[PDB]
């Protein structure tokens, strides 16, 4: 596990960051796609 | 230290490996440069 614990830690850390920035500084709205969730709660009709 | 502890850990781990391979799988003989260290110990003259 000497290097196998580092090489996989070299990517595991880079992999995570790759998500934090692509999901924290520019996450996508997968799901809404032009469709507000009826606001927080505007009753119905 | 959330990311600052990861981004620097993403490189610190890649940086180290960069050395292990360039100093463990192909280290340089900086110092000898065509000059065996008089063998392990062949006395003198």
From Swiss-Prot, chains A, B:
Subcellular location: Virion; Host nucleus; Host extracellular space
Tagged with keyword Transport: yes
CC per GO annotation: host cell; host cell nucleus; host extracellular space; virion component
Intrachain S-S bonds: none
Post-translational modification: Phosphorylated on several residues by host. These phosphorylations regulate VPR activity for the nuclear import of the HIV-1 pre-integration complex.
The keyword Iron-sulfur belongs to this UniProt entry's keyword annotation: no
Family assignment from sequence similarity: Belongs to the HIV-1 VPR protein family.
Subunit composition and interactions: Homooligomer, may form homodimer. Interacts with p6-gag region of the Pr55 Gag precursor protein through a (Leu-X-X)4 motif near the C-terminus of the P6gag protein. Interacts with host UNG. May interact with host RAD23A/HHR23A. Interacts with host VPRBP/DCAF1, leading to hijack the CUL4A-RBX1-DDB1-DCAF1/VPRBP complex, mediating ubiquitination of host proteins such as TERT and ZGPAT and arrest of the cell cycle in G2 phase.
Identification of the protein by name: Protein Vpr
Naturally occurring in which organism (per UniProt): Human immunodeficiency virus type 1 group M subtype B (strain 89.6)
